[PDB]
């Protein structure tokens with residue numbers, strides 16, 4: 108029941124430089140982790156890089172450098188990218204890590220001791236780019252790097268090749284019923300629901316046994332050896348999925364450096380993951396293979412898998428080679444880091460393929476962040492309206508006052524359910540519905556007129572507004588981590604009241620609390636042009 112809340116992103120292939128997809132996945136992971144830290148929970152948030160395999164090894168060869176130098180460099184690009192995005196991830200794991208390799212061999216050996224690994228053959232299609240085994244139903248005709256006729260994945264469009272190899276096989280066929288029993292006993296374990304239904308449909312049809320090794324030549328000897336068989340390398344996906352178990356067993360110092368691998372996951376109280384964040388492209392690996400490996404090894408299953416969609420820009424596919432780039436840092440430098448995160452999390456739900464455009468980014472920045480949130484923060488901290496620069500003591504509440512108070516009191520329960528699904532978009536919308544109501548209340552009450560006309564009434568109006576802004580800001584702090592600090596500083600909210608479920612309560616900050624110092628010229632979110 109009480110354990111460290113454990114949330115993960117995928118670990119990303121290091122065949123190419125990091126891009127928006129990786130940033131988005133890790134963002135979602137970060138937001139979920141931050142919300143749980145805001146509730147006062149212990150959190151461990153994990154991300155990293157998937158560095159073995161034919162895909163990564165062949166990408167190294169193309170650049171004409173050693174896999175060790177290639178992976179170290181690209182991993183460094185991912186780390187730097189994520190530092191720049193200003194996340195709060197607790198550890199960055201690399202599959203080349205020696206302690207991860209130990210955990211993989213340990214798991215392999217468990218699957219083997221269990222009787223679930225035998226020496227067999229795979230003869231069939233393989234997508235090197237997705238490191239994915241495919242049936243003939245999942246391939247079709249296409250053209251290759253030369254424009255010659257070939258076969259491609261229906262899923263990804265990447266070139267497929269026919270593999271015929273003696274491989275170690277995991278008895279995935281034997282886990283059909285246990286997987287179905289898991290899905291049904293936990294009908295919230297895969298999100299969104301239609302992706303859950305997809306997984307169930309696939310497993311219902313039956314599962315073939317899964318190749319978990321490859322001949323070493325095929326992988327250019329860039330992989331983890333099979334314990335007891337140095338001619339075979341461990342399937343990159345079994346290696347990769349194991350990162351979640353490894354990460355749950357690493358003690359990390361202040362620097363973010365791994366200092367020690369514990370023998371048993373219970374010691375650190377992280378495993379199993381509470382939320383595995385993934386893209387829709389890798390659902391089968393996480394919802395079918397992974398729980399099967401865990402069932403086999405006698406390990407506990409993840410509580411939830413959330414699978415999101417794929418971004419476009421200007422209604423077209425993102426690619427530098429096609430002439431349509433989407434650089435997060437460039438966009439964050441122009442519009443703001445928190446604002447860019449807000450947009451990515453607000454514009455689209457997990458069931459959708461989001462679309463970025465500068466038009467729409469500016470519409471949300473101006474309309475929601477500046478006009479709704481920012482305006483409201485300026486109004487209730489203004490020396491023109493809040494003449495004493497403090498949280499006033501309210502007088503008697505009217506029915507209209509109380510209808511707004513009710514929305515503010517209900518908001519935390521509602522945002523919370525949404526964050527836990529998780530459905531971050533709906534959490535944001537719920538908060539901003541309350542911000543829109545506060546603004547409309549402020550417009551109705553015209554506190555600027557009240558200063559001269561009814562100072563007693565202004566106390567009430569101003570207090571409710573401040574408290575609404577505080578509560579909405581608190582719930583938005585996972586989304587706007589830097590701007591929420593600025594807001595709290597402007598409101599004079601003491602540190603202790605900026606986290607903890609105690610402070611989801613209306614009334615946490617007392618009358619008399621002093622506003623923070625006003626800086627000359629500043630605005631929270633500055634609007635931008637609509638050319």
Ligand code: MET
Pocket residue numbers: 116117118119120157347348349350389
């Ligand atoms: C264990 S998650 C592995 C994800 C994979 N490396 C990818 O980029 O799709």
